[PDB]
C-alpha cells in the first residue's frame, strides 16, 4: 500500500519542473485530474513523468512491456533499453525470486488532458496481457547505502532527476519549499505556493537537498513526510526539521527502607521495622556547560508517617555498626520523539553529590514491551518494577551505612542518572514496505550526530515538566549543515512544541509567549544578543520571527509564574501569585476550606499552616510541626481540601471569641523545612509562609 513505483510528474517538457512525487501499488500511473486540487489548474498539465523502482517476478518467463503510450516512452529493465518511443513485441527473460530495476521516461507536449492516464503493462509467453499487478512492483532503495539485492541508484541510462542525497525528493522541493496530501490511499508531494496552501493550513516543509535525513536523525526526510515510518514516532518528529530520538529518565514511585541481616544475629523473627514513603520524581536540566545527560531527582515525602518523632535509626532500631536496605519501584520515562525496543539505558541511584548506591540494569534485549514517546515502561496500567523484585535472586542489595542513612535522612533526596544507550532503530524497509528492528543499526551512531547539528530548546509549558525537543539549524561553519533552511526561533517553537499563532500572536495553548521567560547558556546568549544588536531589537518577544537559531544552541523557556530551582524544577512563586490562586473560596468552616485551585499552583505547595489570632493579636498554631503542613487534599471533582480536623485531634477548630481571626497560610517547595532545626525544634517558627485566608470567626461559620 505504500508500495510500488516512485513516479516524479512534471509541468515542464524537459524533467525540470516537478508538480507531483507519488507512488503507484499497480502498474496503473496515472493521476486522474480529480486529485490535482492542490495544484493550479495551469499546472495540472503534465508534459513529462519519470517512475523509478524494481519488479520481481514470481516466475522465470519471457515478457513483453508496454505501456499506454509507446511512442512517447522510453523505458529501461536494468539498463536495457525494452521500450523506445515505439510498441515493442520483444520478449526479455526474467527469472523468478530475482529483482529488476526499472526506469521509464515519458514525453509529452501540449497534452490537451489534465492528469496523466498511463498504464504499464506486459505480456507472458502465453500471451496473457495485464497491468502490472502489485506484487511484483516495488519502490527504489531510497537509502544511504545499497542493499544486497536492491541498488540505491537507477541506472546512468537517460534522465537522472537531481536528488543529491537520495532520499527521493527532488533538490528543487526540498530548497524551495513542499508540502503533502492525503488522497485516495496515497500520499501527494507538491511545489509549495503560498495562495493555495497557506489558507488550507498545511505544512511548508523544506529540508537540505544534501542531507537525507535533515535532522541527523534515521529516518529520511522522505520517510517522514510520507509516512513510511515506524507509527510510534512521534508527531512532531514527522517534521523534516524535528529531531526523532529517544529521551529517558527513571521515576522512582516511591521506597522501603530497612535494616540489613547480618552475620552476627540468628533471629530473625524479630517484629516490621521498615520505613516505607512516597516518592517524587522530575527530570531535571543543569546549567552544566554542554551537558547532553539524562537524570532525574527524587523528593522523598517529609510528611508525618509513623507515629512518635522518632529519628529513622530509632524506627528500625539501627546502631552505628549497623547497615540499612533499600527497595524502590521505578518506571522508565519517554519524554523524546522515538522509541526503544530492545534495551533500556543503565542508570546510577546516587545518594549526595557522588555516592553511588546502585547500578540499575534491565536485560538487554529481554523487553516485555516497546518504550514508546510520551510514554512509560511498565505501562501505567501494569505494575511497576521493584529494584530488587520479588524472586530475583541475582539483584544485588542497595545498602548504605550509618552514615549515609543519616545522610538520606537530612536530605531526603536522590539523584537518578541514566545513560544514552538506547539500542537499535526500526526502520523503513523499501523492499517490502514494512518497519522493522534493524540490528544493524544502533541509537549510539546517530545521537552525536544529532546533537551536533541541531539547536535544542527545553520547555515546561506542559504541566511544569522539563520537555527537550531538538530542531535542525544551520551551522555557519559546517559546509553541509549550510545547505539546511533558516530556522526562526518562531517556527521552532511551532513545529516542535505546536505553538500557533490564531491572531498574529504566538502562544501554546492559549497562553501567550510572553507568559513565558527564555534562558540562553553563554554561547547562544552571545549569538542571540548579537542577532538583536543587528536588528535594532531591544526585546526578543517582538522579533521572533527574526531571531535565526543555530546548530548546538541551548534554550530554555519556563511559565514566568514560577519560581525555580538549579535543576529548573518549579518550586515556588510570588506571593501575589499563590493568594490570587486560593482567592476565589468555594465553602469555609471550622473543619476547613473548600477551594479551587489551578493545578500547577498545587504542584508548587508541599503545605499549609492554620492558625487562630486572638483580639491581642497573639497567634495559635493549630498544626505546628514542620511534618504536619500536609492537610489538603485533591477531591474527585478536582476542588482542594484543606482540613483543619486532621491535625487538631479529628476536632473542628474551637474559636473562643468570634472576633479571634482563623488564618491560613501556604508553603511553597523552597521554603518547605524538611528536617528539626539543629536545636531540635520540630515548630513551624520561621518558616516563610503566605497568607491566603483570613477570616473572623462570625465571617466563617
Ligand atoms: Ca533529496
Ligand atoms: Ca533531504
Avoid at 76 to 100: C, F, H, M, P
Avoid at 487 to 503: D, R, V, W, Y
Wanted: charged share 25%.
Amino acid at each position: 500500500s505504500s508500495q510500488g513505483l516512485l513516479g516524479y510528474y512534471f509541468s515542464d517538457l524537459n524533467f525540470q519542473a516537478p508538480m507531483v512525487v507519488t507512488s503507484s501499488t499497480t502498474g496503473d500511473l496515472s493521476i486522474p485530474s480529480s486529485e490535482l486540487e492542490n495544484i493550479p489548474s495551469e499546472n495540472q498539465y503534465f508534459q513529462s513523468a519519470i517512475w523509478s523502482g524494481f519488479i520481481k517476478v514470481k516466475k522465470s518467463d519471457e515478457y513483453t512491456f508496454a505501456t499506454s503510450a509507446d511512442n512517447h516512452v522510453t523505458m529501461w529493465v536494468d539498463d536495457q533499453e525494452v521500450i523506445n518511443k515505439a510498441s515493442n513485441s520483444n520478449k526479455i527473460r526474467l527469472e523468478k525470486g530475482r529483482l529488476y530495476q526499472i526506469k521509464i521516461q515519458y514525453q509529452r507536449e501540449n497534452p490537451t488532458e489534465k492528469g496523466l492516464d498511463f498504464k504499464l503493462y506486459w505480456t507472458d509467453s502465453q500471451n496473457k496481457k495485464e497491468v502490472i499487478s502489485s506484487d511484483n512492483l516495488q519502490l527504489p532503495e531510497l537509502k544511504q547505502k545499497s542493499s544486497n539485492s536492491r541498488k540505491k541508484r537507477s541506472t546512468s541510462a537517460g534522465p537522472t532527476v537531481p536528488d543529491r542525497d537520495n532520499d527521493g525528493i527532488p533538490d528543487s522541493l526540498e530548497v524551495e519549499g513542499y508540502t503533502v496530501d492525503v488522497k485516495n490511499k496515497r500520499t501527494f508531494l507538491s511545489p509549495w505556493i503560498s495562495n493555495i496552501h497557506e489558507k488550507k493550513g498545511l505544512t511548508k516543509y523544506k529540508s537540505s537537498p544534501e542531507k537525507w535525513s535533515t535532522a541527523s536523525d534515521p529516518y529520511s526526510d522522505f520517510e517522514k513526510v510520507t509516512g513510511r515510518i515506524d507509527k510510534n514516532v512521534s508527531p512532531e518528529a514527522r517534521h523534516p526539521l524535528v529531531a526523532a530520538y529517544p529521551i529517558v529518565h527513571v521515576d522512582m514511585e516511591n521506597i522501603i527502607l530497612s535494616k540489613n541481616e547480618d552475620q552476627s544475629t540468628q533471629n530473625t523473627d524479630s517484629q516490621t521495622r521498615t520505613i516505607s514513603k512516597n516518592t517524587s520524581t522530575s527530570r531535571t536540566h543543569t546549567s552544566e556547560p554542554g551537558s547532553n545527560s539524562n537524570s532525574s531527582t527524587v523528593a522523598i515525602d517529609h510528611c508525618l508517617s509513623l507515629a512518635g518523632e522518632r529519628t529513622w535509626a530509632e524506627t528500625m532500631g539501627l546502631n552505628t555498626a549497623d547497615t540499612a536496605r533499600l527497595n524502590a519501584n521505578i518506571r522508565y520515562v519517554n519524554t523524546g520523539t522515538a522509541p526503544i525496543y530492545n534495551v533500556l539505558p543503565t542508570t546510577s541511584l546516587v545518594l549526595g553529590k557522588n555516592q553511588t548506591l546502585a547500578t540499575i540494569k534491565a536485560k538487554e534485549n529481554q523487553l516485555s514491551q516497546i518504550l514508546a514517546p510520551n510514554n512509560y515502561y511498565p505501562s501505567k496500567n501494569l505494575a511497576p518494577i521493584a529494584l530488587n523484585a520479588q524472586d530475583d535472586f541475582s539483584s544485588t542489595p542497595i545498602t548504605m551505612n550509618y552514615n549515609q542513612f543519616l545522610e538520606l535522612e537530612k536530605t531526603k533526596q536522590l539523584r537518578l542518572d541514566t545513560d544514552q544507550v538506547y539500542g537499535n532503530i526500526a526502520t523503513y524497509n523499501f523492499e517490502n514496505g514494512r518497519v522493522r528492528v534493524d540490528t544493524g543499526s544502533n541509537w549510539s551512531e546517530v545521537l552525536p550526530q544529532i546533537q551536533e547539528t541541531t539547536a535544542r530548546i527545553i520547555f515546561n509549558g506542559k504541566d511544569l515538566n522539563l520537555v527537550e525537543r531538538r530542531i535542525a539549524a544551520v551551522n555557519p561553519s559546517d559546509p553541509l549543515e549550510t545547505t539546511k533552511p533558516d530556522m526562526t526561533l518562531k517556527e521552532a517553537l511551532k513545529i516542535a512544541f505546536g505553538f500557533n499563532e490564531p491572531n498574529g500572536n504566538l502562544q501554546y495553548q492559549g497562553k501567550d509567549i510572553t507568559e513565558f521567560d527564555f534562558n540562553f547558556d553563554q554561547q547562544t546568549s552571545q549569538n542571540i544578543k548579537n542577532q538583536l544588536a543587528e536588528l535594532n531589537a531591544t526585546n526578543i518577544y517582538t522579533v521572533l520571527d527574526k531571531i535565526k537559531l543555530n546548530a548546538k544552541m541551548n534554550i530554555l523557556i519556563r511559565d514566568k509564574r514560577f519560581h525555580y530551582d538549579r535543576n529548573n524544577i518549579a518550586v515556588g512563586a510570588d506571593e501575589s501569585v499563590v493568594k490570587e490562586a486560593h482567592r476565589e473560596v468555594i465553602n469555609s468552616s471550622t473543619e476547613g476550606l473548600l477551594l479551587n485551585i489551578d493545578k500547577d499552583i498545587r504542584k508548587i505547595l508541599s503545605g499549609y499552616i492554620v492558625e487562630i489570632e486572638d483580639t491581642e493579636g497573639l497567634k495559635e498554631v493549630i498544626n505546628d510541626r514542620y511534618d504536619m503542613l500536609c492537610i489538603s487534599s485533591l477531591r474527585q471533582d478536582g476542588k482542594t481540601f484543606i482540613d483543619f480536623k486532621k491535625y487538631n485531634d479529628k476536632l473542628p477548630l474551637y474559636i473562643s471569641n468570634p472576633n479571634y481571626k482563623v488564618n491560613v497560610y501556604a508553603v511553597t517547595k523552597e521554603n518547605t523545612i524538611i528536617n528539626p532545626s539543629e536545636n531540635g525544634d520540630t515548630s513551624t517558627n520561621g518558616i516563610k509562609k503566605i497568607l491566603i485566608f483570613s477570616k473572623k470567626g462570625y465571617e466563617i461559620g
